[PDB]
């Protein structure tokens, strides 16, 4: 038996409200089917940030949606190499987000997540470390589900108080801000108002493929500032008419079906999985990293005077255990990595749990 | 009442057999939610690759899966601009490759379509034209319907030729492929039994989205010649590491669906709206252009000495008859298509003969 504790994709099972969405798929195909493309968008794009609480983002009626988080990447990094933009990312990152910028020839240059950590500290380390004309956030961060919103406004207020005074373009990866909503002390307040009143140029990324267990039939959405938008939305369009319709009924009963619930089906899972991790490995080789956001995914740091990450992932995998080490996080230097490792936690607790029994059992050698 | 006949997105309704299909999307998301990426994978290219009559990929079995064709482009285009190179691209073609790889910075250079008419041509017409390294078709074209397997396999037998003797990337979009299949004369040969044998550089692009009604749920397939299959590999899953295993499942039972019918509820359709838009426009202004294959789009030359397509497109419209003007397909001119109008055909049969008789109400007026 196999465990797959790698990639984030979600592989839990439906709710019992999931399951009949699930059911009521054939008359979801056929309302699409009858009714306009762009009534889905609209229903869609208003469900999700009506869910998020960005009610600024439905007044400027500008977002754009596409198949996937990395495609909305792939239009930002058009508009990067057409303006001649180099790009300072955050590091730890998963490596996709580098690799597909990368892959786009866009310049990329490292920026370490704790600049930060000090509220107090945001402006004048931003002011001495970034000199590129793009900064690309991910926040909450994958893997460490690090977040400003553990300084409530001013940590991303000082963010975009930099870009504007600096004339950056400030790029953001909100993939895993749902698990922020309805935190009492974290739940995101709307980035819209403040990304729009600041006047800097920006461009936004939301996703629903991290958030629900809809097997990656998904939608993501890209918001820019006015300056920039009209050449976003040509670049945009370039790569695809629309959504399918169809997905985007679907998602729309499931961003409706959280809001009915609070969350509380995406919430529960995780939390099963990350306390089961946190128990299993407490005192083990491999340290829990507490995240400021309890995010989809659990980062653990090797405490051993020899073993690295690497060996961890070895001696795991040959039980057939997998997780990933984090040189698949440090994209600027791998090595850096070597004292990490990252697991999933949007998976089946009865599966997350024997993974975790066999886990300990190999790290207790 | 609007008329779309603009895009050539799939808008017909579910045949009988389909209709199945619709009903079992619960019984289809749970086998996949069980199941295995790698099962839906393989199943879907499997029932893909033998619909089409491609043995030869599925030995090969290096055929990597996207959201979409364009996203597949995109790939490609990641390939094209690591290399430097510059891409000789058909024209006239639809102009959303020009432009997506022109927003990738990738420099483009048209060759007309008229310089595969003539097989025993071909060669040296490419050997004058073709002055970039990389040489992009689109087989059967968008939107003439035109076809190499006009000339059996010899018309890109002797483009292979050509791309091999002289070291030329060949780029092809196989999107409309699915319609020259079952044809008598017509039907694909194995491509990538060429591709291979030759030895010719190659990325080659397969489509769902424009042969069933998937409501853009859909897959698209890239393969690449084994010299830069790990280079491609690798942008590839940069952009994703899966589709959706439950959109594998559906669109493999579409799949299936039509290798039962010999693709009959898809051609049906397109044929009974093709032969209304020819007989509805014959005598008028708008000239119908006879495809090589009855792709999902039909395109038509404007016989008038004053008005352009941008005329037709705008009077249509103003009755809410939408469809495109050929300015849209002549990327590197686009002047030039202002002789020309396309007008999509995976439609529902009655929506689209009302939009005929209207066309064609609107037209005699002028
Ligand atoms: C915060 C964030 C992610 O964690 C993320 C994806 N996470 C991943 C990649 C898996 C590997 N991806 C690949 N090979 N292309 C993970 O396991 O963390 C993406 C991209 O989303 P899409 O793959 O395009 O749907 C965007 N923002
Ligand atoms: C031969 C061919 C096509 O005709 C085609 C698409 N046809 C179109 C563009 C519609 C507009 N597209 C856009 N704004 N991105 C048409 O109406 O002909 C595509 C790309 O397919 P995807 O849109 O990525 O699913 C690839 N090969």
Same mark, same amino acid.
């Given at each position: 038996?196999?465990?797959?504790?790698?990639?984030?994709? $979600?592989?839990?099972?439906?709710?019992?409200?999931?399951?009949?969405?699930?059911?009521?798929?054939?008359?979801?195909?056929?309302?699409?089917?009858?009714?306009?493309?762009?009534?889905? &968008?609209?229903?869609?794009?208003?469900?999700?940030?009506?869910?998020?609480?960005?009610?600024?983002? @439905?007044?400027?009626?500008?977002?754009? @949606?596409?198949? =996937?988080?990395?495609?909305?990447?792939?239009?930002?990094?058009?508009?990067?190499?057409?303006?001649?933009?180099?790009?300072?990312?955050?590091?730890?990152?998963?490596?996709?987000?580098?690799?597909?910028?990368?892959?786009?020839?866009?310049?990329?240059?490292?920026?370490?997540?704790? *600049?930060?950590?000090?509220?107090?500290? +945001?402006?004048?380390?931003?002011?001495?470390?970034? !000199?590129?004309?793009?900064?690309?956030?991910?926040?909450?961060?994958?893997? $460490?589900?690090?977040?400003?919103? !553990?300084?409530?406004?001013?940590?991303? &207020?000082?963010?975009? #108080?930099?870009?504007?005074?600096?004339?950056?373009?400030?790029?953001?990866?909100?993939?895993?801000?749902?698990?922020? %909503?309805? &935190?009492?002390?974290?739940?995101?307040?709307?980035?819209?108002?403040?990304?729009?009143?600041?006047?800097? #140029?920006? %461009?936004? +990324?939301?996703?629903?493929?991290?958030? /629900?267990?809809?097997?990656?039939?998904?939608?993501? %959405?890209?918001?820019?500032?006015?300056?920039? /938008?009209?050449?976003?939305?040509? @670049?945009?369009?370039?790569?695809?008419?629309?959504?399918?319709?169809?997905?985007?009924?679907?998602?729309?009963?499931?961003?409706?079906?959280?809001?009915?619930?609070? %969350? =509380?089906?995406?919430?529960?899972?995780?939390?099963?999985? #990350?306390?089961?991790?946190?128990?299993?490995?407490?005192?083990?080789?491999?340290?829990?990293?507490?995240?400021?956001?309890?995010?989809?995914? =659990? /980062?653990?740091? *090797?405490?051993?005077?020899?073993?690295?990450? $690497?060996?961890?992932?070895?001696?795991?995998?040959?039980?057939?255990?997998?997780?990933?080490?984090?040189?698949?996080?440090?994209?600027?230097?791998?090595?850096?990595?070597? =004292?990490?490792? #990252?697991?999933?936690?949007?998976?089946?607790? &009865?599966?997350?749990?024997?993974?975790?029994?066999?886990?300990?059992?190999?790290?207790?050698?």
């Amino acid at each position: 038996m196999k465990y797959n504790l790698a990639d984030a994709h $979600t592989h839990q099972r439906q709710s019992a409200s999931q399951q009949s969405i699930v059911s009521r798929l054939p008359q979801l195909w056929y309302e699409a089917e009858e009714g306009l493309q762009a009534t889905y &968008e609209k229903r869609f794009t208003e469900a999700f940030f009506q869910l998020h609480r960005q009610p600024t983002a @439905l007044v400027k009626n500008k977002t754009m @949606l596409s198949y =996937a988080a990395s495609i909305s990447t792939m239009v930002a990094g058009m508009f990067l190499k057409k303006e001649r933009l180099a790009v300072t990312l955050i590091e730890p990152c998963f490596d996709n987000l580098y690799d597909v910028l990368a892959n786009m020839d866009v310049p990329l240059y490292p920026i370490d997540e704790s *600049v930060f950590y000090d509220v107090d500290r +945001i402006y004048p380390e931003l002011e001495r470390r970034v !000199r590129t004309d793009a900064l690309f956030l991910v926040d909450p961060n994958n893997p $460490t589900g690090f977040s400003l919103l !553990r300084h409530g406004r001013k940590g991303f &207020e000082e963010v975009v #108080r930099f870009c504007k005074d600096h004339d950056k373009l400030l790029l953001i990866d909100f993939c895993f801000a749902s698990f922020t %909503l309805f &935190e009492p002390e974290l739940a995101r307040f709307d980035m819209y108002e403040l990304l729009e009143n600041s006047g800097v #140029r920006y %461009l936004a +990324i939301e996703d629903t493929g991290k958030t /629900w267990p809809v097997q990656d039939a998904k939608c993501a %959405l890209i918001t820019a500032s006015d300056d920039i /938008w009209e050449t976003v939305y040509n @670049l945009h369009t370039s790569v695809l008419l629309n959504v399918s319709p169809f997905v985007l009924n679907m998602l729309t009963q499931y961003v409706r079906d959280s809001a009915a619930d609070r %969350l =509380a089906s995406v919430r529960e899972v995780l939390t099963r999985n #990350r306390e089961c991790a946190r128990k299993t490995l407490d005192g083990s080789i491999l340290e829990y990293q507490e995240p400021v956001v309890k995010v989809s995914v =659990a /980062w653990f740091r *090797v405490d051993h005077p020899e073993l690295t990450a $690497t060996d961890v992932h070895r001696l795991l995998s040959a039980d057939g255990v997998y997780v990933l080490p984090g040189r698949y996080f440090y994209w600027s230097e791998p090595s850096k990595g070597d =004292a990490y490792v #990252r697991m999933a936690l949007a998976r089946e607790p &009865e599966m997350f749990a024997d993974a975790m029994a066999l886990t300990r059992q190999v790290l207790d050698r």
